[PDB]
Design a protein around this ligand. Structure first.
Ligand SMILES: Nc1nc2c(ncn2[C@@H]2O[C@H](COP(=O)(O)OP(=O)(O)NP(=O)(O)O)[C@@H](O)[C@H]2O)c(=O)[nH]1
Ligand SMILES: [Mg+2]
Lengths: 175, 145
């Protein structure tokens, strides 16, 4: 039979303030499309994307988090099982960037010790509304020694690269 | 009303899974009938016996995929139920808080509850596939030791 089977299962998590574009980032990675209508996430959700790295298929179970603080207590449940975590902020929203420090200590508080963190500056396609300088995004990522990407769910910038890099990070650390 | 895009996508997946499944079933048969033909012949024998090995390993592969296909069909139905629950929840959610009765709050809560359940059910199917995978890797290692 021609349709093969996956060889490993990775569980990822997307966290960030409501409206940073977590869902759109995932939908671009899953279905390669983009919708402009803001439909806020309810509770929690996840998608399946299987991708090939190092010659071995990897199934990605990517959990999508509701940014609204009414569901924050739910998301905290899913930190422990996560193998990779996406911190997503909005370059057009200064408040979403200052809350990054707060999100990070929710990670170290709950998630496993060997968890892979990654910072995503979404909506990088909006030059005229940019509030957070790219340099500031790399600065704080460097102080935590994590990776950083300025992404765009609309223009499809650094989305495929972002997820694939997080997976290759996880794959290298398993022996 | 006319069928929406996201439902149509789910539809083609389901149909495609059934086609794949039917191919598995017929392959499982064609190998069963061929299996009786090799068994009767024995009653170069020596190699005749490992074209039958090659078959046994392939028959094994078919069962593995069949198991995956059956679970795959269950996932889509849960995804279908999840969309319906999700739309039923946003309708209630958007209505003005000023005009919400306890009944309106309760039913809004029971759908949310029911919504989170199908998501937990979906997660169980994901784990189920992983538990099979680890069993078949274990078998594979021994089978090719
Ligand atoms: N221009 C632009 N808009 C984007 C981008 N990503 C998301 N958006 C828009 O920003 C809004 C929020 O997107 P969404 O993914 O729903 O945000 P979220 O992070 O899922 N929020 P929540 O936590 O409530 O579910 C939507 O209107 C969406 O179209 C992007 O890269 N570029
Ligand atoms: Mg969302």
């Amino acid at each position: 039979m021609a349709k093969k089977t996956y060889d490993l299962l990775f569980k990822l998590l997307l966290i960030g303030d409501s409206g940073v574009g977590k869902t759109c980032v995932l939908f671009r990675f899953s279905d390669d499309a983009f919708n402009t209508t803001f439909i806020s996430t309810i509770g929690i959700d996840f998608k399946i994307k299987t991708v090939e790295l190092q010659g071995k298929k990897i199934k990605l179970q990517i959990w999508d988090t509701a940014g609204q603080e009414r569901f924050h207590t739910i998301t905290t449940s899913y930190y422990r099982g996560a193998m990779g975590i996406m911190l997503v902020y909005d370059i057009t929203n200064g408040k979403s960037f200052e809350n990054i420090s707060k999100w990070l200590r929710n990670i170290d508080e709950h998630a496993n010790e060997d968890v892979e963190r990654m910072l995503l500056g979404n909506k990088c396609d909006m030059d005229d509304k940019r509030v957070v300088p790219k340099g500031k995004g790399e600065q704080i990522a460097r102080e935590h020694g994590i990776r950083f990407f300025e992404t765009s769910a609309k223009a499809n910038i650094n989305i495929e690269k972002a997820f694939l890099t997080l997976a290759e990070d996880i794959l290298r650390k398993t022996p | 009303g006319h069928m929406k895009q996201e439902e149509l996508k789910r539809l083609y997946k389901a149909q495609a899974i059934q086609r794949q499944l039917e191919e598995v079933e017929e392959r499982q048969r064609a190998s069963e009938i061929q299996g009786v033909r090799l068994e009767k012949a024995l009653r170069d024998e020596a190699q005749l016996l490992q074209e039958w090995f090659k078959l046994v390993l392939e028959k094994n592969k078919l069962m593995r995929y069949e198991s995956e296909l059956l679970i795959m069909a269950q996932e889509l139905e849960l995804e279908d139920h999840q969309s319906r629950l999700e739309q039923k929840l946003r309708e209630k959610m958007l209505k003005e808080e000023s005009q919400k009765d306890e009944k309106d709050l309760n039913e809004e809560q029971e759908v949310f509850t029911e919504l989170m359940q199908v998501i937990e059910q979906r997660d169980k199917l994901v784990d189920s596939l992983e538990e099979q995978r680890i069993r078949e890797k274990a078998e594979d290692q021994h089978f090719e030791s």
